[PDB]
Structure 1
Amino acid sequence: AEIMKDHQIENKKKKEVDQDKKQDQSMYSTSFKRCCKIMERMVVQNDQEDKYHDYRYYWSKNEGHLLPIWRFSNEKQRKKNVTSICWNPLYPDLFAVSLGSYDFTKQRMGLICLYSLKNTTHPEYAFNCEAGVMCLDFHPKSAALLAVGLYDGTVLVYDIRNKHKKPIYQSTVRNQKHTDPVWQVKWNPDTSKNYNFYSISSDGRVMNWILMKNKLEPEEVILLRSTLIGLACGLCFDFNKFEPHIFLVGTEEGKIHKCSRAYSGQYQETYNGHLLAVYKVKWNNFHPRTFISASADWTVRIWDSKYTSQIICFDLSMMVVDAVWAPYSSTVFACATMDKVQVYDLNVDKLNKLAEQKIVKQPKLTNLSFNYKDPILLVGDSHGGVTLVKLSPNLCKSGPEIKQTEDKKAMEEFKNVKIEDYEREKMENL
């Protein structure tokens, strides 16, 4: 205290106005709130200690084992479907799943819930929306920025930091918001031009949204556009990490189209392999010009951008809902179909699925997501329950010899090299 008196710089704040009010709810608010939040997690931690100990290190030859650990769901939100799932770039523990309503004929309000790994009893953040949220995404540079896509094409921007929880930005008829439903929404990595928002509507008009002050500016990147009436419907869109200009957009028609930001009215290439609408198209990690697409027709196909046809096609009796590449290692992907989730590694097996599991018997899986930080897969049920399953240690990169050649470059180069070698083998077979 004497030292503070000696040096009167930045006098301590936190003036004791406090809460007062005498009775009927004195104090019980910010320093005390942190203690209560810590206490709730500690009580949950003791009960879930057996599960928590297994999650930290249970440690799960061509075999795969998947174990569901916890399921997060709300009885009130049981009608809502899981739909889009995302993980904050800044914190591996925080992942947000935005509930949405499928089947079209039945429409209900969708609640966006961010579930922290520390507390699984209830969502860390709860958001109420007029219509079900089709897609939810997090900006890579800032965890707080959140992109939300809802029915009637409304685009919602939410900041986690804001206490009020009202949408930071919205899309209106004057802002040229697209019609139908925006199935896929993504955040552009580049921050030079403020913040760029990419949204693909059911009508089929790629929309680029730039954050402004009390206003949003929308720019149409491309038009889906043949003896047919109206614009082609697009159910998904993805941007190659290696090249920003080239982006792949899926369509309801069933033909995947590679697109370039520079040419609004031109298509770089078109793939006619799929016979039904492709639910999700994603570029493979650690390699360029390669991607995996999941379609309504129950087949999963891996394509090469240079080629006009899918290099490998996987047939599943149950309809395929979505396919996601593994962030940790290339040539690893997970497909969830009719309560069955299957993970395939090209090196481990040419065609046979390494592992097949059913995390929840009662509900169909709306969507599945992959965590970059650890080998944990999030699966979303039809009832909105979200369950995370940790993958086995049998599948790993640089597996022929452990710690062989000591190549730091190989983690981001040998994986790229391995897919090319695998790709060459497919060409020889065909």
Structure 2
Amino acid sequence: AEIMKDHQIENKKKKEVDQDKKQDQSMYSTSFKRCCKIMERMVVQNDQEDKYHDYRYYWSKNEGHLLPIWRFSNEKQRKKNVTSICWNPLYPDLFAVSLGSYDFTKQRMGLICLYSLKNTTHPEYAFNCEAGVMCLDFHPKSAALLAVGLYDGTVLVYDIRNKHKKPIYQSTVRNQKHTDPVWQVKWNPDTSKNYNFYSISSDGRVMNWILMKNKLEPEEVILLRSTLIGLA
């Protein structure tokens, strides 16, 4: 305390405003949230200890053996199909699955779930969307940048960092969004020309999307394209 008084250089913040409110949810919020999150995982850990001891080093001549360990699901979300899955390039524990609808004739809303290997009970992050999310991807350099594609060929971008959990970016008719769906979506590794996001539609136009301040610039890469009608 006397050393901080001696050397007043970068005075200690975290001012004691707190939450307060007397009763009906007092604080229960940011240092305590960490303690709650840690407690949850460590409670799970003790019940799954038998499976976790196997996962790390069970160690499972021309024969192979595959062992299923954990299943991550939700009873509300049993209607939707898994479609695309991806792993974060920074963190090998955190992976993202993007639940959407197949079979065309039946179409519902889709929720993107980012399951951590830490907590297998429910997702680390949820993301409600307007239609079924077909394709999901992570940007190799900054793993926060999350690339999303869903029906009506709308292209979404999310940040895991952001708390509000709304889309950072969206494609519109004015930004030349492709019709029908977006089956596959990938990040360009190069970061010289901002952040290049690649997408394909069933309409059959490979679209390169560049991130700008409160706008998305589209660029037609190639067209798929014979005695037929329309684009392949």
Bin of the TM-score, shorter chain as denominator length: over 0.9
CA distance in structure 2 between the partners assigned to 1:181 and 1:44 by the alignment: 38
Offset from partner CA, 1:33-73 (integer Å, 9 cap, x none): 00000000000000000000000100001000000000000
The one-character-per-residue Cα deviations of 1:188-207 (angstroms, maximum 9, x if unpaired) are 00000000000000110000
Inter-partner Cα distance in structure 1 for 2:120 and 2:154? 30
For 1:8, the equivalent position in structure 2 comes to: 8
Encode CA deviations 1:283-327: one digit per residue, 9 max, x unaligned.
xxxxxxxxxxxxxxxxxxxxxxxxxxxxxxxxxxxxxxxxxxxxx
Give 1:121 shift: 0.1
1:211 offset after TM fit, Å?
Answer: 0.2
C-alpha deviation, 1:107, in angstroms: 0.2
How far off is 1:15 after superposition? Answer: 0.2
Offset, 1:166? 0.3
SS at match of 1:136: strand
Q: CA RMSD in A?
A: 0.3
**In the TM superposition, what is the alpha-carbon distance from 1:228 to its structure 2 partner?**
0.3
Q: Number of residue pairs matched? A: 232
1:147 alignment partner, SS class = strand
- Aligned to 1:70, the other structure's residue is in SS state coil
Q: Secondary structure at the match of 1:69?
A: coil
TM-score of the two chains, using structure 2 as the length reference: 1.00
Q: Distance in 1 between matches of 2:192 and 2:51?
A: 44
Residue deviations 1:158-199 (CA, integer Å, cap 9, x gap): 000000000000000000000000000000000000000000
Q: Look up the match of 2:46.
A: 46
> Helix, strand or coil for the counterpart of 1:45?
helix
Q: Return the offset for 1:24.
A: 0.3
- Cα deviation, residue 99, structure 1: 0.2
After superposing on structure 2, the runs of 4+ consecutive aligned residues of structure 1 that deviate more than 4 Å are none
2:217 aligns to what SS in structure 1? strand
> 2: CA distance between counterparts of 1:7 and 1:52?
47
- What secondary structure sits across from 1:68 in the alignment? coil
Find the residue that maps to 1:71 and give its secondary structure. coil
> 1:58 maps to what in 2?
58
**Partners of 1:186 and 1:144 in 2: CA distance:** 14
| Alpha-carbon distance in 2 for matches of 1:79, 1:148 | 20
Q: Aligned equivalents of 1:181 and 1:151: distance in 2?
A: 4
1:2 shift after superposition: 0.2
The alignment partner of 1:76 has SS state of coil
Q: Partner of 1:181 in structure 2?
A: 181
Q: CA deviation at 1:91?
A: 0.2
Give the structure, 1 or 2, with the largest relative contact order (CA under 8 Å, sep 6 or more): 1
Distance 2:195 2:51 in 1: 40
Deviation of residue 151 (structure 1)?
0.3
Whole-angstrom CA distance in 2 between matches of 1:154 and 1:74: 25
- Which whole-Å CA distance do the structure 2 matches of 1:76 and 1:175 have between them? 34
Deviation at 1:133, TM superposition (A): 0.2
Once residues 151 and 165 of structure 1 are traced to their aligned partners in structure 2, the CA distance between those partners, rounded to angstroms, is 20
Instruction: State the 1:155 CA deviation.
Output: 0.2
2:61 and 2:20 mapped to 1: Cα distance?
Answer: 66
CA distance in 1 between counterparts of 2:24 and 2:72 reads: 33
SS at match of 2:45: helix
What is the aligned partner in structure 1 of residue 21 from structure 2? 21
The whole-number CA distance in structure 2 between the counterparts of 1:46 and 1:101 is 35
SS at 1:34's partner residue?
helix
Rounded to whole Å, the distance in 2 between the matches of 1:116 and 1:28 is: 23
Provide the rounded CA distance (Å) in 2 between the counterparts of 1:150 and 1:46: 38
Can you list the C-alpha shifts for 1:76-111, whole angstroms capped at 9, x where unaligned? 000010000000000000000000100000000000
The aligned counterpart of 1:105 is: 105
Output one character per residue of 1:382-405: Cα deviation in whole Å (capped at 9) or x when no partner: xxxxxxxxxxxxxxxxxxxxxxxx
Please give the secondary structure, in 1, of the residue aligned with 2:70.
strand
For residues 79 and 138 of structure 2, what CA distance do their matches in structure 1 show?
A: 25
Which runs of 5 or more structure 1 residues have no equivalent in the other structure? 233-430
Give the structure 2 partner of residue 228 of structure 1.
228
Return the offset for 1:156. 0.2
TM-score, normalised relative to structure 1: 0.54
Three-state SS of the structure 1 residue aligned to 2:55 is helix
- The Cα of 1:25 is off from its aligned counterpart by 0.4
Please state whether the residue corresponding to 2:167 is helix, strand or coil: coil
Q: Take 2:228 and 2:203, find their aligned partners in 1: how far apart are those partners?
A: 14
Partner SS for 2:61: coil
Structure 2 gap ranges (5+): none
Q: Can you list the C-alpha shifts for 1:201-244, whole angstroms capped at 9, x where unaligned?
A: 01100000000000000000000010000000xxxxxxxxxxxx
Quick check: which one's strand share is greater?
Answer: 1
